Scaffold this active site. Structure first.
Site, PDB file in Angstrom:
ATOM      1  N   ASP A 190      39.920  36.386  40.450  1.00  0.00           N
ATOM      2  CA  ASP A 190      38.857  37.389  40.375  1.00  0.00           C
ATOM      3  C   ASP A 190      39.354  38.823  40.708  1.00  0.00           C
ATOM      4  O   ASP A 190      38.721  39.552  41.487  1.00  0.00           O
ATOM      5  CB  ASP A 190      37.652  36.943  41.242  1.00  0.00           C
ATOM      6  CG  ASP A 190      36.363  37.709  41.018  1.00  0.00           C
ATOM      7  OD1 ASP A 190      35.999  37.933  39.841  1.00  0.00           O
ATOM      8  OD2 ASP A 190      35.694  38.038  42.020  1.00  0.00           O
ATOM      9  N   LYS A 203      39.745  42.615  40.175  1.00  0.00           N
ATOM     10  CA  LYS A 203      38.948  43.698  39.586  1.00  0.00           C
ATOM     11  C   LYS A 203      39.102  44.902  40.511  1.00  0.00           C
ATOM     12  O   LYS A 203      39.369  44.692  41.699  1.00  0.00           O
ATOM     13  CB  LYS A 203      37.430  43.377  39.607  1.00  0.00           C
ATOM     14  CG  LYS A 203      36.949  42.047  39.110  1.00  0.00           C
ATOM     15  CD  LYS A 203      35.466  41.899  39.348  1.00  0.00           C
ATOM     16  CE  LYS A 203      35.114  41.684  40.800  1.00  0.00           C
ATOM     17  NZ  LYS A 203      33.657  41.446  40.994  1.00  0.00           N
ATOM     18  N   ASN A 247      37.557  44.499  44.057  1.00  0.00           N
ATOM     19  CA  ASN A 247      38.259  43.614  44.995  1.00  0.00           C
ATOM     20  C   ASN A 247      39.579  44.204  45.471  1.00  0.00           C
ATOM     21  O   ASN A 247      40.368  43.514  46.098  1.00  0.00           O
ATOM     22  CB  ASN A 247      38.464  42.233  44.409  1.00  0.00           C
ATOM     23  CG  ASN A 247      37.187  41.500  44.193  1.00  0.00           C
ATOM     24  OD1 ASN A 247      36.209  41.669  44.920  1.00  0.00           O
ATOM     25  ND2 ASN A 247      37.164  40.680  43.173  1.00  0.00           N
ATOM     26  N   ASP A 277      38.560  39.303  48.504  1.00  0.00           N
ATOM     27  CA  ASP A 277      37.650  38.391  47.782  1.00  0.00           C
ATOM     28  C   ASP A 277      38.405  37.174  47.236  1.00  0.00           C
ATOM     29  O   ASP A 277      38.677  37.078  46.034  1.00  0.00           O
ATOM     30  CB  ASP A 277      36.893  39.172  46.684  1.00  0.00           C
ATOM     31  CG  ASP A 277      35.596  38.609  46.131  1.00  0.00           C
ATOM     32  OD1 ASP A 277      35.591  37.420  45.698  1.00  0.00           O
ATOM     33  OD2 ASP A 277      34.626  39.400  45.978  1.00  0.00           O
ATOM     34  N   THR A 287      53.935   5.129  31.682  1.00  0.00           N
ATOM     35  CA  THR A 287      54.103   4.942  30.238  1.00  0.00           C
ATOM     36  C   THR A 287      52.789   5.371  29.580  1.00  0.00           C
ATOM     37  O   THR A 287      51.716   4.987  30.063  1.00  0.00           O
ATOM     38  CB  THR A 287      54.456   3.491  29.900  1.00  0.00           C
TER      39      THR A 287
END
Ligand SMILES: Cc1n[nH]c(N)c1-c1cccs1
Ligand SMILES: Cc1n[nH]c(N)c1-c1cccs1
Ligand SMILES: [Cl-]
Ligand SMILES: [Cl-]
Lengths: 282, 282
Positions: B117, B119, B122, B138, B157
């Site tokens: 997040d 941005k 933040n 954040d 397998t």
């Protein structure tokens, strides 16, 4: 080593079936004790919550030097032991067993659980009889479906959101389809006595065989099997998970539209239930 | 409501910055209290373990009627407040801030954490000065990288393994690349004063813009910005996550090969450290 005093207090342990045979002291009834060396947290939680006749039940649990899980004893053993060494079941027995495997996996999906490890070795038979109740076991690789990080992410504005995340929206919520692929490989093995994908007498890699969805078709083997059965196998072994048959779609397939097989299952069900039966309000 | 007696015992609460200003009673120093209504489990665990100058530190925690997280107070506020309303930072300030954002995210990835997040809202600034220390905050959407269910699955397998699972092997382990995309959107915003992807004066959907990776390029705006800065933006805003620049690749890019900017950061670092400094063994 020795068994914990707590387990010993309730159960008289016996022979290996690691899974061992044990006798509950209170009832003298046989049980199976699955020993895991010290994920079992989710497995117990999943199994305690599930309640279906074709899904194994936890009877008790012990967290000691090792994990001890007390389960219903299945006297017929593994489906693997009936299909190993090119041995093939009658088409009718495949239907009966498959129908139960579909009901169990439908229940799982309805309840937001993906098994993730369906194989003949995780399918147990109730008796040594051909016509019997089967049960799904080994929920150690199972996954719980809840509210995704993707659902939360989609709520906001994607100004800063990476493109691969937006691309993943197309396929999101098709995880359960891995169980349907597995069921198609199990059904193929049961009907033919041979695996659809193998490194035996092949130039193509097991990986390349699977992603291409080009299973090994041997006409001589499949001539004994009906067109309806093979049509259902073809429908589950579809590479695109969005196009692959779901358990509901498989359950509506003509091959499972058999009232005889369905009566035999209901018969086996009530025969098992006869012991538990509390009097009824008329 | 009121604050819990436990928080009140240690802190004198104040004005809203929900995030509030508070004074630790012992030191009289200012702190920030992040209040979350009753995921915060992982957030605290992640933050307690991380130790980097460009990552916010937890000072204390309270689990009551609400969650109370005591954090370092950042007096310059959010980077958002410096970039909102078509406001654009000097190219040199972008470099300084970006360099720290890269160091922080490199640390996170080195430590098996994906922020998810990133941005401008933040990213916090230490002082009201243009040349300052920034910190990433954040960690509520952050993710911990460990041993995958895929790694465990690949050990066996694949006889029963669904093709989509084998296809996913190609991309597996590129989740961290979402943070690099985010950094490229942040760098674009900082240099231009406008977002690369928006629904403002566009016919194409925000989704279609992102997946195509066709950002809005306005020549008049970018003529003020160097070719080197734009080359780095172009390298982070790559649609294929396997091809996208990593934090190490960004850190080796010519735009960050600036000894002046690097000295200014080291300067701000030691100025902050001067208070904490314990005598040295010569
Ligand atoms: C559980 C359980 N119940 N009854 C049997 N035979 C088992 C086994 C699981 C795995 C191996 S044996
Ligand atoms: C944490 C923290 N430390 N110093 C500030 N201003 C914050 C804020 C985070 C989110 C809004 S304000
Ligand atoms: Cl013993
Ligand atoms: Cl109060």
């Amino acid at each position: 080593s020795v068994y914990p005093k707590a387990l010993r207090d309730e159960y008289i342990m016996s022979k290996t079936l690691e899974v061992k045979l044990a006798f509950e002291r209170k009832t003298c009834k046989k049980v199976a004790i699955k020993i895991i060396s010290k994920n079992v947290e989710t497995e117990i939680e999943i199994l305690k919550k599930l309640n279906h006749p074709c899904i194994i039940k936890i009877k008790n649990f012990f967290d000691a030097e090792d994990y001890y899980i007390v389960l219903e004893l299945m006297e017929g053993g593994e489906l693997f032991d009936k299909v190993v060494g090119n041995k093939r079941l009658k088409e009718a027995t495949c239907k009966l067993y498959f129908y139960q495997m579909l009901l169990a996996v439908q229940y799982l999906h309805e309840n937001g659980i993906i098994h993730r490890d369906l194989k003949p070795e995780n399918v147990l038979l109730s008796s040594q009889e051909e016509d019997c109740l089967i049960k799904i076991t080994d929920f150690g690789h199972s996954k719980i479906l809840g509210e995704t990080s993707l659902m939360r992410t989609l709520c906001g504005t994607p100004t800063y959101l990476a493109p691969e995340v937006l691309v993943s929206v197309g396929t999101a919520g098709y995880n359960r389809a891995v169980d349907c692929w597995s069921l198609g490989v199990i059904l193929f093995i049961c009907l033919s006595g041979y695996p659809p994908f193998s490194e035996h007498r092949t130039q193509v890699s097991l990986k390349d065989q699977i992603t291409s969805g080009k299973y090994n078709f041997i006409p001589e083997v499949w001539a004994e099997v009906s067109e309806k059965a093979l049509d259902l196998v073809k429908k589950l072994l579809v590479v695109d998970p969005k196009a692959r048959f779901t358990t509901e779609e498989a359950l509506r397939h003509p091959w499972l539209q058999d009232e005889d097989m369905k009566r035999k299952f209901q018969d086996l069900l009530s025969e098992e239930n006869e012991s538990t039966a509390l009097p009824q309000v008329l």
